[PDB]
Amino acid sequence: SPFSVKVGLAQMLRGGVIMDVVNAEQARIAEEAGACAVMALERVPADIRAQGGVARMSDPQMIKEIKQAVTIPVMAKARIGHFVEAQILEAIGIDYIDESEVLTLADEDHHINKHNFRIPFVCGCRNLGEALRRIREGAAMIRTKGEAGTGNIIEAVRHVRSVNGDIRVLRNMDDDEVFTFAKKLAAPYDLVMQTKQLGRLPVVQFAAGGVATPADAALMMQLGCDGVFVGSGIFKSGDPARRARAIVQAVTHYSDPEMLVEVSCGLGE
Amino acid sequence: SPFSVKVGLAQMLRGGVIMDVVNAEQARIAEEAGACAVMALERVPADIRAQGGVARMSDPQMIKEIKQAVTIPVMAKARIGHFVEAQILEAIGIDYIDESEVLTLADEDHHINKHNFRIPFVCGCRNLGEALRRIREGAAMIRTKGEAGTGNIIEAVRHVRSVNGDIRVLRNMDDDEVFTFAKKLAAPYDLVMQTKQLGRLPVVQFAAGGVATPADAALMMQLGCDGVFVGSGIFKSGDPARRARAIVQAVTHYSDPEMLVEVSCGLGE
Amino acid sequence: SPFSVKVGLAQMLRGGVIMDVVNAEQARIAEEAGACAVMALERVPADIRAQGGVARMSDPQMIKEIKQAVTIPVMAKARIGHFVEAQILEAIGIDYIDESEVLTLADEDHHINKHNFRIPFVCGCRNLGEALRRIREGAAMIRTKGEAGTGNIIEAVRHVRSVNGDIRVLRNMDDDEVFTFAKKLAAPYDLVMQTKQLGRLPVVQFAAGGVATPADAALMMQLGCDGVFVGSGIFKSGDPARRARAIVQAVTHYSDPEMLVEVSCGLG
Amino acid sequence: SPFSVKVGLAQMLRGGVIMDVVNAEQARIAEEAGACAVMALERVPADIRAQGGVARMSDPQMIKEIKQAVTIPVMAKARIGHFVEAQILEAIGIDYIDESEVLTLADEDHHINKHNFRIPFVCGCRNLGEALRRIREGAAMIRTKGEAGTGNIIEAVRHVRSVNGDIRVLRNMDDDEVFTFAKKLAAPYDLVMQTKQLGRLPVVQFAAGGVATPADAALMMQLGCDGVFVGSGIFKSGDPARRARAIVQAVTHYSDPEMLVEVSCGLGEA
Amino acid sequence: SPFSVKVGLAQMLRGGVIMDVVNAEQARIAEEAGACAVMALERVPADIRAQGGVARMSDPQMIKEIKQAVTIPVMAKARIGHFVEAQILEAIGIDYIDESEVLTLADEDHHINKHNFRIPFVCGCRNLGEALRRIREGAAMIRTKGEAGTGNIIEAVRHVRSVNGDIRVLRNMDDDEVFTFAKKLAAPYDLVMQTKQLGRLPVVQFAAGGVATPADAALMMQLGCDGVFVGSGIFKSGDPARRARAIVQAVTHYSDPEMLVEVSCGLG
């Protein structure tokens, strides 16, 4: 199927860090630091909503500038339910679309039908039911919603523990009880049973929302995530090439404390 | 698959009436009157609960007596969730098992896993979500729950109108909106989409609970059911061979008022 | 009847974009960009209420200036229930009146009896019942209420999905059940049954409230609208001839992503 | 320890049926039918409470009569918290004491400290937390509370599914999360961790309350119980030797439908 | 076991005062004044939250600077549930980690599994049940939560009285009733029974949160604590060597009023 092709594409990002960037310079620092992809963003939605504004797709022009500055894959955000924003992003020729709750919602009741597109989608989740719903709609990659813009890891930890915990429950559960379990999650039975056989989520699972330090990033990997997203706070500090590199190093050497000491040392705020 | 074989078996009952019987005599009147099957019952559960008692599987002995008295298929009731009652009924060699809410519940949270059996199951439903849940668990045939023991048709009408109404909604619905619809029904998406393509329920749908007169039975057929169940009230009146025949005639000639007048005439109490 | 004449007039707008304008200059940019009509407005009601003021009919003088600047149809707003504001708008000789919830309400319980006028009316709606009520009162054209002044498309999507969804339900429904359905919508049965036979609304249905980008406009067309209204935000940016043209292009080529990329590029 | 000795004794009951009896005749029918033990009871507590009465320990005399009529182990009920009733039962020389919620409660806040006795105890439970609390107090054997006296199996199924379900959850759980899990169950952490390693309850687990038919008994075994208790309803029907034998046969052949047909056939009324 | 080794290490601190420091200078004044250990802190979390910020592990660099300035043990804070912050603190080679509610929480449902580490941990508590839960997770040392940042001793007194009071109840209690008592505390029975036999907490118990004066510190010792923590308020006054020494003197001579007068005199 073309679904398993999209799932396969997203697997190449396993073990990587994805960085939000607002210009080609940032994009280049990110690539040099060893990011596996970048996320294009004309303004951080934190700061548009701070001013009480609507946050939408970025201008295709600035996305094109970033696509040219780098050789790593490029992602961009569409509003939830805004399938025409997604059509535009596909036609520009980027690599992944993020149907993102950080932008202003466009449809209160329906997500994009992601099976109608050739490129893969990322969606967010707080729990296993939500993740399986996004996958059935055609998401090829899942991240935690966390809590964007705060630098606080609490919500991201809750979401990872929740998803992984339910998978563990499901793996060992009496088969006869799975029907009721699917009902309570409001999730498709067939994907529930498949998650039981795999013993893990059928797609890559990244952490996102509030990852601020090397320790944060390594924690997410130790809890069982496949990779991490990081926001543009990286570029508000002193040597942003150093802070970027540090987070990549942390995800790569997530189970080596000695390495984590080295990259954390003298990082400033 | 063996599932579609079970579905196929249940289809040969289309257009028929199924009668509850408590002995071989009743079973023979039923067969002679033109019933497509009988439902074996040592006591009516109405009257065991009337006395405040527990209603269970019938004694296998009396089921065997009925199986021998007739050449039409024989059905029997198991308590919801009581998979060992069902194993016994299968081993006796009857034709259909009804996982029945009219008997005392055995498991408050789980139905029988009906895929683990070779013979087909009937389950009840009040709405489309419930029906699709029973089917995914492996029911090959659906009936309305109605309201057993009252002779009042109102609950049965509510349930038929509900199921058929949601199927009509589903048939014409924007495909992108079906994901949310499946969530709200708490039903497996894949069976929802299949119901949309067929434009009807993937299994036979019978009416049950409160059918008392030829007019009642014909109404159910005019509302789009595939057949009807009838309780043992027909054996509590005069010439029960006449009352039984009348209901069969009504279901067969459900759109001929002249016929319905003839069979309804002078039917007594 | 003169009702079907008004319905026919409103159908000429199918496929078009309608732009709010505050002067003759704006009106001309709109016409040049390919707007099918303009909506005359002395001030945006967003900003009169922002100051806590009452928003009423525009001065007839400035409406006359706009009517002379252009050859496309001109629309104007009357307060809900203010049938004398409407009489004045008719006598000026504009083409369409919008009985508008964006202006301050004049009658809390009654809309204008729109059958007593020669020119066609637009009304807003949030759902099918509301739309059918407005039509029976004599609206010749329907738009979503959406959410005016915010640039947020969410309310408009809710309204379109709601109306279209109920029409799809109605189309396939057991005829015997339509009586109860009409009661629950609080709508005239005869218009419900007519909507069932057509399989769509008996009048043109436009989207309005929060359309800000080419993508927004195209989305509304892909969801099944007949056209779109757009506010004066278009004229607050650079090269407003470019932004205006972009939205027209988007509605015209609404199912061509390649086109949508081109018009969306470098817009701000 | 003497605790693990008591646990060991109770293993010999695995695979068996335990029957309530009110006299030596009933006790003999039970033994002949193949019961692994009997539970002595001067009256069914169902029927003493039916009359609104207090239900206590049985007269030691009638317990002695039953102990002599049979060669299988004999159990008897003590009221919850009534440690002197238990002392008496121990001194009579029976085999097991059931600290039973079917009798009238004697202490609303405290169970018997079962470690102060030489003979093993049975306790009831509705969930895993309750079971582990009873074990730490020194129960050597656990049963479901179910719902005694109704012939309705639903409460017993709820309790078995609950206990077994939590054990399965626990077996696979991140070790770091077990601290919070113990807190929420209000159960001793050390017994929780032990239950995680074994992958089952550290003691024998029987079903009780509402088992009325061979099918009921077999269902309990298929759900993972080690055995079943059955009340004196068995003796209120025709040929009670037949109904008793049938339930034993069902527990013995619990995964053979053909056998279950044979024993269920023509059993008369319950 | 290595657990009893950690318990033994924490006992060397009995009778002492632990001071929060933000630099090597402060650390040296503390050591000279007779502090039994220091707690390294790049900023007081009071003032990061005052600004509405997240409070995390300190930069390992500044911790290393403090570790080099002094020969007494050095402690540092990790966020609750952040076991990787703790791994980093272990690898730097400090002596004690404080899993601290004064920093921003990282895991709402789980504390660190402290048995997976070689160095000893401090945890906070408000009551006996909470203390026993922290110990079973592997804390080697307990402090009151008190109320950080206020200089108000009331919460600390509540917590000490609570813990000590329950231990006194437990010591004399009918053994048969201890099962129910363990359930109500939601604490492991085996640690409850051990606390009953000792007649005190199986680990050292310090007071923390709101200790501001020599009298405060002495009160905590008279109520039965084994030692006290003190914040960086000490360093915001004149001659902070004098204020530091005063608190050490108070804890050392906690039942001598004459001494307490002398050290309290003219302190500000």
Author numbering:
A (entry chain D), B (entry chain A): 22 to 290
C (entry chain C), E (entry chain C): 22 to 289
D (entry chain B): 22 to 291
Quote the study on this structure.
We show that with diminishing volumes, nucleation becomes improbable, but this can be countered by seeding. A seeding strategy was used to overcome the improbability of Pdx1 nucleation occurring with diminishing droplet volumes. Pdx1 and trypsin I droplet preparations required the use of seeds within the mother liquor. In droplets a 2:1 mixture of seeds (107 ml−1) diluted in mother liquor with 12 mg ml−1 Pdx1 was used. At low picolitre and femtolitre scales, nucleation becomes improbable and can be bypassed using a seeding strategy for producing crystals only a few micrometres in length. Droplets were collected in microcentrifuge tubes and stored at room temperature for 2–3 days with a mineral oil overlay to prevent coalescence. Crystals were retrieved from droplets by a procedure called ‘breaking the emulsion’. Lysozyme and Pdx1 crystals were concentrated by settling and applied to sheet-on-sheet (SOS) chips. Serial synchrotron crystallography (SSX) data for lysozyme and Pdx1 crystals grown in batch and within microfluidic droplets were collected on the new ID29 beamline at the European Synchrotron Radiation Facility (ESRF, France) using a 2 × 4 µm (V × H) beam of 11.56 keV X-rays, with a 90 µs pulse and 231.25 Hz repetition rate, and a 20 µm step movement between images. A JUNGFRAU 4M detector with a sample-to-detector distance of 175 mm (1.8 Å in the corner) was used to collect diffraction patterns.
